[PDB]
């Protein structure tokens, strides 16, 4: 259900974007996001590799966002590959694309449905990364997320949520 | 259900593992694929767990999902850890993961007083690079009977 | 807030035991946390630096050779682009694999590398496994930055890795030009008629 | 929080008489060590210790099992914990926590009643060499590091041996830590 | 109604007087070793001291169970006592008979150390009573490796000689001393087993 902190990481490991927005406070805030992004890409690598011998992913639309971005029932690409962690102060999802590019939302609203309205908030911040940062000839390729029309836009978003 | 079944002792090393489709419950040849990068695994989540939990009382993992099956955990301030790979369309385990504990592993492995309550071989070799195994007969048997309805 | 610039992720490669992770250690500032090796695999620091007017941040990614992590290690050279072998002059065996580490390195990590090549262990200097000058002609004909490296007392890191940041900056320091932003007018009543 | 837990743990839970067991049989197992020994007292309490480590280790898990807690790290939380939901759990007292040092460190557990001692007269010839209950002292030098702390605990006086009460000062020295699985590559 | 405490620190503590026999023999005064306030204390334990009797020479085995049936003596003539302030009505110290303290033991110690009765007994009438427990209460517990069931009945035997003891100790409380022996005697459906003399 609900977010409290957007982490986008690359598709080479190390993040380029994250904001923990009403934290309200002054959180910890350096390079042990790094470290985090990596760690996090390290364990969606090793959860593929082990799997038991056994040998889905309908989502729908609930209106999110309050037109809106898509009206049907889609798929996800990343079966072997982690997908929720689940704690008792925060659960965290993730969300892999197509290319590789996985994204990260921490929540604070802890306790199978979950992930129902959880990727169709994640491709709707996915839609707003490939119309906003993509056409921006000042992005390079593969650099921190620089641009300030990527954060009010994601913003409203959330705040139309919770 | 049930997939399969582990121990990780204060040590970090496996010192129980039941595989079904009756597989081995012993470390012959699924050894060494996943069993330390599991608690690698495992270890890992539970360290950012603890850089990212305000409040008082910190927490630890309570399930992993990925997109086919499940990880629970339950993880005993003696450093003792029930890790357990399941399936989806059931809730958390975490009541079974607890009856597990108060009333197979302390009625039969620490009460019992013939075999040791694992912490090592008393070696500086059993920090993670030793082997040994549990293999009390009763044990074994109530634990492959309890889970044994859970398909 | 974060400010830097440009982030590239630098591998540290080698066969195990040549002292990679000591020649890190001093090296890095340091990474906050001493964490383990061997749980996820490979381990990270970072390091900042400056090129040219822009920031850089650098992500040192140190890589453990187990035989477990067969997949995963080859997972984790996936959009590699700075890259460095290290090998020691003491023991010999590791320079009969480094050219296979060169070759598995080549593969799979960008469309072009820049691979350094750095000697440990330079403080035993009457133990040479193999003479430096063959490894430095090895160098010469695979485009690669050679250092002593030796251990304790040195900076040849610290102008060796700088030097591969710039190298490695120009093969992605492509152009800009300017964010002035001054150009200011019109200030009226506005008579206006549509 | 916790007092009520201690009790609805004190609902179901295997219980027998304290009076006419269990005092014999710790009385038993410290005469066979005055005679065993053969009337020496000042190497008892160094077997005593010795078997209260060796009790405990292996209590510790059944305790973790009882009540669902997690490892404790302040001495708040252990002296809150041993207070209230460990010897009420286990032998149906309480203690206080008095003599409070600096820095948060090295505290005092004196036990008001206490079910090892209860009923014993003790003889002359053990006034200055002997410790009755030193179990005690065994069980929470090894209970207390299988928490991975590490700790100190020592009796410093007791009711058979002088009018004032029985109290153990446990100090805390250094806290151990988790160790990485494996040595290197 | 008595004042109480829990049975499973009892139990615990009623497991592991035998690591303390092997103790207070073989330590007359792999080991190991910790420190106290500048103090340093030699500690071996229970996996490392049990074993220690299967290879055990014989007269130090034996040095061992007199131990044991003397810890048991102590806490049964100490323990009759305080079951005679219970009730224990209706038989006296001399006591011609002996059905009639047997239907004391079963009904009024086995009771107060384990719970139960010991549910068979069977009489030889010239003073020979055999009293069967099916699940005795301690070694609820114990079982060796991946089947070798026969080398833990000869592990486990020292375990017996507690209520070789108390037998000894509740009939001391009436009036001499007698022999004793233990046996195992598994049952017939979902064993242990004492004499008299």
């Given at each position: 259900?609900?977010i409290?902190?957007i982490?986008?990481?690359?598709?080479?490991?190390?993040?380029?974007?994250q904001?923990?927005?009403?934290?309200?406070?002054?959180?910890?805030?350096?390079?042990?996001?790094?470290?985090?992004?990596?760690?996090?890409?390290?364990?969606?690598?090793?959860?593929?590799?082990?799997?038991?011998?056994?040998?889905?992913?309908?989502?729908?639309?609930?209106?999110?966002?309050m037109?809106?971005?898509f009206?049907?029932?889609?798929?996800?690409?990343?079966?072997?590959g982690?997908?929720?962690?689940?704690?008792?102060?925060?659960?965290?999802?993730?969300?892999?694309?197509l290319?590789?590019?996985?994204?990260?939302?921490?929540?604070?609203?802890?306790?199978?449905?979950?992930?129902?309205?959880?990727?169709?908030?994640?491709?709707?911040?996915?839609?707003l990364?490939s119309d906003?940062?993509?056409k921006?000839?000042?992005?390079s390729?593969?650099?921190?997320?620089?641009?300030?029309?990527?954060?009010?836009?994601?913003?409203?978003?959330?705040?139309?949520?919770? | 259900?049930?997939?399969?079944?582990?121990?990780?002792?204060?040590?970090?090393?496996?010192?129980?593992?039941?595989?079904?489709?009756?597989?081995?419950?012993?470390?012959?040849?699924?050894?060494e694929?996943?069993?330390?990068?599991?608690?690698?695994?495992?270890?890992?989540?539970?360290?950012?767990?603890?850089?990212?939990?305000?409040?008082?009382?910190?927490?630890?993992?309570?399930?992993?999902?990925?997109?086919?099956?499940?990880?629970?955990?339950?993880?005993?301030?003696?450093?003792?850890?029930?890790?357990?790979?399941?399936?989806?369309?059931q809730?958390?385990?975490?009541?079974v993961?607890?009856?597990?504990?108060?009333?197979?592993?302390?009625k039969?492995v620490?009460?019992?007083?013939?075999?040791?309550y694992?912490?090592?071989?008393?070696?500086?070799?059993?920090?993670?690079?030793?082997?040994?195994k549990?293999?009390?007969?009763n044990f074994?048997?109530?634990?492959?009977?309890?889970?044994?309805?859970?398909? | 807030?974060?400010?830097?610039?440009?982030?590239?992720?630098?591998?540290?490669?080698?066969?195990?035991?040549?002292?990679?992770?000591n020649?890190?250690?001093r090296?890095?500032?340091?990474?906050?946390?001493?964490?383990?090796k061997?749980?996820?695999?490979?381990?990270?620091?970072?390091?900042?630096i400056?090129?040219?007017?822009?920031?850089?941040?650098?992500?040192?990614?140190?890589?453990?050779?187990?035989?477990?992590?067969r997949?995963?290690?080859?997972?984790?050279?996936?959009?590699a682009?700075?890259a460095?072998?290290?090998?020691?002059?003491?023991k010999?065996?590791?320079?009969?694999?480094?050219?296979?580490?060169?070759?598995e390195?080549?593969?799979?990590?960008?469309?072009?590398?820049?691979?350094?090549?750095?000697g440990?262990?330079?403080?035993?200097?009457?133990?040479?496994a193999?003479?430096?000058?063959?490894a430095?002609?090895?160098?010469?004909?695979?485009?690669?930055?050679?250092?002593?490296?030796?251990?304790?007392?040195?900076?040849?890191?610290?102008?060796?890795?700088?030097?591969?940041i710039?190298?490695?900056?120009?093969?992605?320091?492509?152009?800009?030009?300017?964010?002035?932003?001054?150009?200011?007018?019109?200030?009226?009543?506005?008579?206006?008629?549509k | 929080?916790?007092?009520?837990?201690?009790?609805?743990?004190?609902?179901?839970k295997?219980?027998?008489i304290?009076?006419?067991?269990?005092?014999?049989?710790?009385?038993?197992?410290?005469?066979?060590?005055?005679?065993?020994?053969?009337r020496?007292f000042?190497?008892?309490?160094?077997?005593?210790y010795?078997?209260?480590?060796?009790?405990?280790?292996?209590?510790?898990?059944?305790?973790l099992?009882?009540?669902?807690?997690?490892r404790?790290?302040?001495?708040?939380?252990?002296?809150?914990?041993?207070?209230?939901?460990?010897?009420?759990?286990?032998?149906?007292?309480t203690?206080?926590?008095?003599?409070?040092?600096?820095?948060?460190?090295?505290?005092?557990?004196?036990?008001?009643?206490?079910?090892?001692?209860?009923?014993?007269?003790?003889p002359?010839?053990a006034?200055?060499?002997?410790?009755?209950?030193?179990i005690?002292?065994?069980?929470?030098?090894?209970?207390?590091?299988?928490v991975q702390?590490?700790?100190d605990?020592?009796?410093?006086?007791?009711?058979?041996?002088?009018?004032?009460?029985?109290?153990?000062?446990?100090?805390?020295?250094?806290?151990?830590?988790?160790?990485?699985?494996?040595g290197?590559? | 109604?008595?004042?109480?405490?829990?049975?499973?620190?009892?139990?615990?503590?009623l497991?592991?007087?035998?690591?303390?026999?092997?103790?207070?023999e073989?330590?007359?005064?792999?080991?190991?070793?910790?420190?106290?306030?500048?103090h340093?204390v030699?500690?071996?334990?229970?996996?490392?001291?049990?074993?220690?009797?299967?290879?055990?020479?014989?007269?130090?085995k034996?040095?061992?169970?007199?131990?044991?049936?003397?810890?048991?003596?102590?806490?049964?003539?100490?323990?009759?006592?305080?079951?005679?302030?219970s009730?224990?009505?209706?038989?006296?110290?001399?006591?011609?008979?002996?059905?009639?303290?047997?239907?004391?033991?079963?009904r009024?110690?086995?009771?107060?150390?384990?719970?139960k009765?010991?549910?068979?007994?069977?009489?030889?009438?010239?003073?020979?009573?055999?009293?069967?427990?099916?699940?005795?209460?301690p070694?609820?517990?114990?079982?060796?490796?991946?089947?070798?069931?026969?080398?833990?009945?000869?592990?486990?035997?020292?375990?017996l000689?507690?209520?070789?003891?108390i037998?000894?100790?509740?009939?001391?409380?009436?009036?001499?001393?007698?022999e004793?022996?233990?046996?195992?005697?598994?049952?017939?459906?979902?064993?242990?087993?004492?004499?008299?003399?």
């Amino acid at each position: 259900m609900a977010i409290e902190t957007i982490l986008v990481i690359n598709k080479s490991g190390g993040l380029i974007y994250q904001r923990n927005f009403t934290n309200d406070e002054q959180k910890l805030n350096s390079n042990e996001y790094l470290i985090l992004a990596s760690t996090l890409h390290g364990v969606f690598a090793i959860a593929s590799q082990l799997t038991p011998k056994a040998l889905n992913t309908i989502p729908y639309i609930p209106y999110v966002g309050m037109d809106d971005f898509f009206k049907e029932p889609f798929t996800n690409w990343n079966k072997s590959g982690l997908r929720q962690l689940c704690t008792d102060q925060f659960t965290m999802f993730i969300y892999q694309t197509l290319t590789g590019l996985k994204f990260v939302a921490i929540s604070s609203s802890v306790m199978n449905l979950a992930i129902q309205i959880a990727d169709n908030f994640l491709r709707k911040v996915y839609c707003l990364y490939s119309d906003y940062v993509m056409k921006d000839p000042s992005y390079s390729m593969e650099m921190p997320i620089r641009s300030n029309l990527f954060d009010e836009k994601v913003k409203k978003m959330v705040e139309n949520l919770q | 259900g049930i997939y399969s079944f582990w121990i990780f002792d204060r040590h970090c090393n496996c010192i129980f593992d039941r595989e079904w489709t009756l597989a081995s419950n012993s470390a012959s040849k699924q050894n060494e694929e996943d069993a330390k990068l599991l608690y690698g695994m495992i270890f890992s989540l539970r360290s950012i767990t603890q850089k990212l939990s305000k409040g008082s009382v910190k927490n630890d993992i309570r399930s992993i999902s990925t997109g086919k099956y499940r990880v629970h955990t339950y993880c005993t301030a003696s450093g003792l850890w029930f890790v357990l790979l399941s399936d989806f369309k059931q809730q958390s385990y975490t009541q079974v993961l607890q009856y597990i504990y108060s009333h197979i592993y302390v009625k039969y492995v620490s009460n019992n007083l013939l075999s040791p309550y694992d912490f090592a071989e008393n070696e500086n070799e059993m920090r993670g690079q030793g082997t040994r195994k549990i293999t009390n007969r009763n044990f074994i048997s109530v634990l492959e009977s309890f889970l044994a309805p859970m398909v | 807030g974060y400010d830097y610039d440009y982030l590239f992720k630098i591998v540290l490669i080698g066969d195990s035991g040549v002292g990679k992770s000591n020649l890190l250690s001093r090296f890095t500032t340091d990474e906050f946390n001493i964490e383990s090796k061997s749980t996820i695999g490979v381990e990270f620091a970072t390091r900042t630096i400056e090129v040219e007017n822009k920031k850089i941040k650098a992500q040192i990614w140190d890589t453990a050779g187990q035989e477990r992590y067969r997949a995963i290690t080859s997972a984790y050279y996936r959009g590699a682009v700075g890259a460095l072998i290290v090998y020691d002059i003491s023991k010999s065996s590791s320079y009969e694999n480094c050219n296979h580490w060169l070759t598995e390195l080549r593969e799979n990590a960008d469309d072009n590398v820049a691979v350094g090549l750095i000697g440990n262990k330079s403080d035993l200097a009457h133990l040479r496994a193999v003479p430096t000058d063959e490894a430095k002609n090895f160098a010469m004909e695979n485009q690669m930055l050679f250092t002593e490296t030796s251990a304790l007392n040195s900076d040849n890191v610290d102008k060796a890795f700088r030097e591969l940041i710039v190298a490695i900056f120009q093969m992605v320091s492509k152009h800009q030009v300017d964010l002035s932003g001054s150009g200011t007018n019109n200030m009226g009543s506005n008579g206006a008629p549509k | 929080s916790l007092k009520a837990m201690g009790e609805e743990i004190w609902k179901n839970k295997t219980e027998k008489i304290n009076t006419e067991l269990f005092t014999l049989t710790y009385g038993s197992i410290v005469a066979q060590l005055c005679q065993d020994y053969e009337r020496d007292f000042n190497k008892v309490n160094d077997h005593l210790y010795s078997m209260g480590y060796n009790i405990g280790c292996r209590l510790i898990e059944d305790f973790l099992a009882r009540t669902a807690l997690p490892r404790c790290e302040n001495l708040v939380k252990t002296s809150e914990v041993l207070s209230k939901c460990a010897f009420k759990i286990f032998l149906n007292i309480t203690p206080n926590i008095t003599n409070w040092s600096h820095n948060k460190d090295t505290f005092s557990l004196i036990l008001d009643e206490n079910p090892l001692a209860d009923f014993v007269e003790l003889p002359m010839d053990a006034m200055k060499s002997l410790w009755y209950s030193n179990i005690l002292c065994g069980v929470l030098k090894g209970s207390l590091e299988m928490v991975q702390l590490d700790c100190d605990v020592w009796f410093v006086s007791d009711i058979l041996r002088g009018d004032s009460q029985t109290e153990i000062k446990v100090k805390l020295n250094r806290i151990l830590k988790d160790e990485i699985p494996i040595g290197e590559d | 109604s008595l004042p109480k405490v829990s049975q499973s620190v009892y139990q615990m503590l009623l497991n592991e007087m035998v690591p303390l026999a092997m103790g207070i023999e073989r330590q007359i005064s792999i080991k190991r070793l910790k420190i106290e306030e500048h103090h340093t204390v030699d500690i071996i334990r229970s996996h490392n001291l049990i074993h220690e009797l299967y290879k055990a020479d014989e007269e130090e085995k034996e040095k061992v169970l007199a131990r044991l049936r003397n810890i048991g003596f102590q806490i049964g003539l100490k323990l009759s006592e305080l079951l005679i302030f219970s009730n224990n009505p209706n038989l006296k110290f001399k006591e011609m008979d002996l059905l009639l303290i047997m239907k004391f033991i079963c009904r009024d110690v086995w009771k107060q150390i384990f719970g139960k009765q010991i549910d068979n007994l069977k009489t030889n009438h010239r003073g020979t009573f055999y009293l069967l427990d099916y699940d005795y209460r301690p070694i609820q517990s114990f079982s060796l490796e991946e089947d070798a069931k026969n080398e833990e009945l000869k592990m486990i035997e020292p375990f017996l000689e507690i209520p070789v003891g108390i037998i000894r100790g509740v009939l001391s409380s009436l009036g001499y001393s007698s022999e004793e022996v233990i046996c195992l005697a598994s049952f017939i459906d979902r064993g242990v087993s004492f004499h008299v003399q």
